[PDB]
Design an enzyme around this catalytic site. Structure first.
Site, PDB file in Angstrom:
ATOM      1  N   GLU A 175     -19.017 -24.577   0.613  1.00 34.47           N
ATOM      2  CA  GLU A 175     -17.748 -24.901   0.344  1.00 34.47           C
ATOM      3  C   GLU A 175     -17.258 -25.630   1.498  1.00 34.47           C
ATOM      4  OE1 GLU A 175     -17.432 -23.828  -3.677  1.00 34.47           O
ATOM      5  OE2 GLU A 175     -16.143 -25.274  -2.509  1.00 34.47           O
ATOM      6  N   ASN A 203      -8.642 -33.260  -5.251  1.00 35.14           N
ATOM      7  CA  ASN A 203      -9.386 -33.253  -6.594  1.00 35.14           C
ATOM      8  C   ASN A 203      -8.789 -34.321  -7.541  1.00 35.14           C
ATOM      9  OD1 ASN A 203     -11.004 -30.887  -5.746  1.00 35.14           O
ATOM     10  ND2 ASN A 203      -9.084 -29.599  -6.017  1.00 35.14           N
ATOM     11  N   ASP A 209      -7.364 -33.886 -10.530  1.00 35.00           N
ATOM     12  CA  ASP A 209      -6.243 -33.447 -11.000  1.00 35.00           C
ATOM     13  C   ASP A 209      -5.100 -33.588 -10.439  1.00 35.00           C
ATOM     14  OD1 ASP A 209      -6.571 -31.226  -9.716  1.00 35.00           O
ATOM     15  OD2 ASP A 209      -6.563 -29.887 -11.636  1.00 35.00           O
ATOM     16  N   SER A 245      -4.447 -31.668  -7.738  1.00 32.74           N
ATOM     17  CA  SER A 245      -4.542 -30.484  -6.815  1.00 32.74           C
ATOM     18  C   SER A 245      -5.619 -30.761  -5.441  1.00 32.74           C
ATOM     19  CB  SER A 245      -5.303 -29.248  -7.503  1.00 32.74           C
ATOM     20  OG  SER A 245      -6.792 -29.365  -7.709  1.00 32.74           O
ATOM     21  N   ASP A 278      -8.305 -28.461  -2.730  1.00 32.40           N
ATOM     22  CA  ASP A 278      -8.974 -27.367  -2.233  1.00 32.40           C
ATOM     23  C   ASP A 278      -8.464 -27.043  -0.781  1.00 32.40           C
ATOM     24  OD1 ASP A 278      -9.917 -26.969  -4.996  1.00 32.40           O
ATOM     25  OD2 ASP A 278     -12.052 -27.494  -4.092  1.00 32.40           O
ATOM     26  N   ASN A 305      -7.997 -23.489  -4.644  1.00 33.81           N
ATOM     27  CA  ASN A 305      -7.436 -24.581  -5.270  1.00 33.81           C
ATOM     28  C   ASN A 305      -5.870 -24.380  -5.520  1.00 33.81           C
ATOM     29  OD1 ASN A 305      -6.728 -25.940  -8.248  1.00 33.81           O
ATOM     30  ND2 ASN A 305      -8.070 -26.982  -7.002  1.00 33.81           N
TER      31      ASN A 305
HETATM   32  C1  D2L Z   1     -10.675 -21.398  -9.720  1.00 35.54           C
HETATM   33  C2  D2L Z   1      -9.976 -22.413  -9.178  1.00 35.54           C
HETATM   34  C3  D2L Z   1     -11.029 -23.768  -9.584  1.00 35.54           C
HETATM   35  C4  D2L Z   1     -10.338 -24.939  -9.328  1.00 35.54           C
HETATM   36  C5  D2L Z   1     -10.543 -25.997 -10.441  1.00 35.54           C
HETATM   37  C6  D2L Z   1      -9.547 -25.762 -11.241  1.00 35.54           C
HETATM   38  C7  D2L Z   1     -11.215 -25.476  -7.670  1.00 35.54           C
HETATM   39  C8  D2L Z   1     -12.110 -26.381  -7.807  1.00 35.54           C
HETATM   40  C9  D2L Z   1     -11.455 -27.938  -7.776  1.00 35.54           C
HETATM   41  C10 D2L Z   1     -12.648 -28.622  -8.246  1.00 35.54           C
HETATM   42  C11 D2L Z   1     -12.302 -30.072  -8.451  1.00 35.54           C
HETATM   43  C12 D2L Z   1     -13.462 -30.810  -9.340  1.00 35.54           C
HETATM   44  S1  D2L Z   1     -13.020 -32.784  -9.653  1.00 35.54           S
HETATM   45  O1  D2L Z   1     -14.064 -33.240  -9.599  1.00 35.54           O
HETATM   46  O2  D2L Z   1     -12.127 -32.673 -10.859  1.00 35.54           O
HETATM   47  O3  D2L Z   1     -11.951 -33.162  -8.328  1.00 35.54           O
HETATM   48  C13 D2L Z   1     -12.394 -33.880  -7.016  1.00 35.54           C
HETATM   49  C14 D2L Z   1     -13.258 -35.306  -7.167  1.00 35.54           C
HETATM   50  C15 D2L Z   1     -12.445 -36.325  -6.386  1.00 35.54           C
HETATM   51  C16 D2L Z   1     -13.178 -32.954  -6.450  1.00 35.54           C
HETATM   52  C17 D2L Z   1     -12.918 -33.342  -4.782  1.00 35.54           C
HETATM   53  C18 D2L Z   1     -13.736 -32.372  -3.651  1.00 35.54           C
HETATM   54  C19 D2L Z   1     -13.026 -30.955  -3.904  1.00 35.54           C
HETATM   55  C20 D2L Z   1     -13.764 -33.221  -2.583  1.00 35.54           C
HETATM   56  C21 D2L Z   1     -15.063 -32.884  -1.673  1.00 35.54           C
HETATM   57  C22 D2L Z   1     -13.970 -28.638  -7.213  1.00 35.54           C
HETATM   58  C23 D2L Z   1     -14.365 -27.237  -6.780  1.00 35.54           C
HETATM   59  C24 D2L Z   1     -14.814 -27.552  -5.211  1.00 35.54           C
HETATM   60  N1  D2L Z   1     -12.886 -26.389  -6.740  1.00 35.54           N
HETATM   61  C25 D2L Z   1     -13.326 -24.928  -6.397  1.00 35.54           C
HETATM   62  C26 D2L Z   1     -14.291 -24.461  -5.323  1.00 35.54           C
HETATM   63  O4  D2L Z   1     -15.468 -24.661  -5.637  1.00 35.54           O
HETATM   64 NA    NA Z   2      -9.549 -32.014 -10.828  1.00 39.97          NA
END
Ligand code: D2L
Ligand code: NA
EC number: 3.2.1.17
Length: 129
Positions: A35, A46, A48, A50, A52, A59
């Site tokens: 991570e 991310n 949406d 948000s 991390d 998140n």
């Molecule tokens: C329980 C809470 C869940 C959350 C989600 C509800 C957390 C998710 C977010 C996810 C985002 C996925 S995304 O593709 O839509 O957005 C970005 C792409 C531009 C990700 C960009 C990455 C992070 C840059 C390195 C990815 C994941 C890493 N974390 C949790 C930890 O693993």
């Molecule tokens: Na997202």
């Protein structure tokens, strides 16, 4: 702070993550490796809107407040910046809530894709724990 591997294992174990919700310490160390590369200051935006935060990439849509995330719920009741501290207490306590939420460690995408089903105990080998 960039933790060493055994340094992080010891801190995680002291804070009660070893076998928390049935996940052995190596699962947690592996998760943090992929991570955040053991870096408490890691942040990643991310799609949406948000972000991390921290060693376990927690998140801002559900778990912490960063002031810029639509639909924020702040279930850990902390500013997201608290998850960037050299002291991992807040990240661990929030991670305990996350992993208890019903999907276990599948909440961590890097854990699912790079740790789940692998020899996770390798991540604590050599450590005096
Ligand atoms: C329980 C809470 C869940 C959350 C989600 C509800 C957390 C998710 C977010 C996810 C985002 C996925 S995304 O593709 O839509 O957005 C970005 C792409 C531009 C990700 C960009 C990455 C992070 C840059 C390195 C990815 C994941 C890493 N974390 C949790 C930890 O693993
Ligand atoms: Na997202």
């Amino acid at each position: 702070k960039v933790f060493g591997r055994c340094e992080l294992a010891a801190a995680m174990k002291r804070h009660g993550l070893d076998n928390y919700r049935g996940y052995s310490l190596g699962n947690w160390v592996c998760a943090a490796k992929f991570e955040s590369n053991f870096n408490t200051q890691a942040t990643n935006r991310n799609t949406d809107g948000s972000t991390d935060y921290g060693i376990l990439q927690i998140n801002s849509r559900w778990w912490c407040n960063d002031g810029r995330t639509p639909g924020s719920r702040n279930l850990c009741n902390i500013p997201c910046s608290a998850l960037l501290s050299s002291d991992i207490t807040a990240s661990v306590n929030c991670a305990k809530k996350i992993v208890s939420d019903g999907n276990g460690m599948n909440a961590w995408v890097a854990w699912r894709n790079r740790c789940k089903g692998t020899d996770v105990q390798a991540w604590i080998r050599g450590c005096r724990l």
